[PDB]
Amino acid sequence: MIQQTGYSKKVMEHFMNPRNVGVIDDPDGYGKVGNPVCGDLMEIFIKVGDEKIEDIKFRTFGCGAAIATSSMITEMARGKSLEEAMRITRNDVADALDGLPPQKMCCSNLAADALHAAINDYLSKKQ
Amino acid sequence: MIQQTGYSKKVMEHFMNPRNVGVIDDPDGYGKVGNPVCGDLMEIFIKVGDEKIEDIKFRTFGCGAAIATSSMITEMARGKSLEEAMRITRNDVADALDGLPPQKMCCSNLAADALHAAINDYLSKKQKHLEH
Numbered sequence: 541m542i543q544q545t546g547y548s549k550k551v552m553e554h555f556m557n558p559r560n561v562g563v564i565d566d567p568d569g570y571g572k573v574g575n576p577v578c579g580d581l582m583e584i585f586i587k588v589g590d591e592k593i594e595d596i597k598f599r600t601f602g603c604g605a606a607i608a609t610s611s612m613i614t615e616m617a618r619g620k621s622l623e624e625a626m627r628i629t630r631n632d633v634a635d636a637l638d639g640l641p642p643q644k645m646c647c648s649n650l651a652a653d654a655l656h657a658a659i660n661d662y663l664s665k666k667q
Numbered sequence: 668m669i670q671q672t673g674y675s676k677k678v679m680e681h682f683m684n685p686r687n688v689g690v691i692d693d694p695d696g697y698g699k700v701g702n703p704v705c706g707d708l709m710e711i712f713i714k715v716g717d718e719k720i721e722d723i724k725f726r727t728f729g730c731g732a733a734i735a736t737s738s739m740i741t742e743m744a745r746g747k748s749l750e751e752a753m754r755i756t757r758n759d760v761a762d763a764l765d766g767l768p769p770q771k772m773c774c775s776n777l778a779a780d781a782l783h784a785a786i787n788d789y790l791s792k793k794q795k796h797l798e799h
């Protein structure tokens with residue numbers, strides 16, 4: 541078949557063994573975003589120590605692509621400064637996600653969006 | 668809230684600890700169906716012994732609802748006769764699925780559809796004397 545899309549080994553790994561699944565009780569930052577197509581929700585929790593992401597968790601009922609991308613992005617964001625974290629997007633893992641069905645772009649965007657939201661929440665709390 | 672939707676505890680359980688995830692190499696029956704809206708694929712693999720489902724696996728990259736329903740339905744189908752298996756639908760776990768966002772109906776249909784497809788595959792192999 542021409543124009544094959546599907547699931548790569550990295551993505552599969554992230555699906556099967558996602559990093560940073562769960563919740564943080566009374567978090568410094570909480571972000572929740574929704575996928576406009578399927579309606580799945582993505583939630584990200586941050587603990588901020590120094591001015592860095594000390595801990596990060598995510599939970600979602602969405603699809604394999606959303607979960608793997610969340611695994612990736614939260615791994616990336618662990619230990620980064622808030623400023624660095626705010627600049628993380630799905631592009632930072634474009635290599636891993638290449639070959640995914642293209643409709644999973646929205647799924648992939650959930651993670652970074654939720655991170656951003658969390659950070660914003662934290663900032664506003666800091667007022 | 669009006670028109671409340673959400674997720675049950677059973678569905679949560681199935682999402683977190685799904686039964687029968689994976690593949691069967693050289694299966695007696697193979698079924699693959701697709702969700703027309705998101706594009707996710709659902710695959711079911713059966714081993715048939717004594718005109719029963721001896722072993723069953725599923726593989727999907729779809730959403731929590733799809734995965735939990737698959738977990739349920741493959742659990743149900745283990746050990747059933749082909750005839751019984753063909754009659755299993757999402758309705759057999761209607762209680763677990765009640766109140767899901769309505770877009771998850773197609774997600775929930777994937778499992779039983781793929782089961783059906785698998786069984787049909789097996790049957791047609793049998794008819795063609797190509798079964799093992």
Ligand code: FES
Pocket residue numbers: 575578579580602603604605606646647650705730
């Ligand atoms: S299908 Fe809903 S997040 Fe991907």
Ligand code: FES
Pocket residue numbers: 578603702705706707729730731732733771774777
């Ligand atoms: S969103 Fe794709 S199977 Fe449910």
Ligand SMILES: [Fe+2]
Pocket residue numbers: 576577645646
């Ligand atoms: Fe989108």
Ligand SMILES: [Fe+2]
Pocket residue numbers: 703704772773
């Ligand atoms: Fe549908």
Ligand SMILES: [Fe+2]
Pocket residue numbers: 701702703772773774776777
């Ligand atoms: Fe369907």
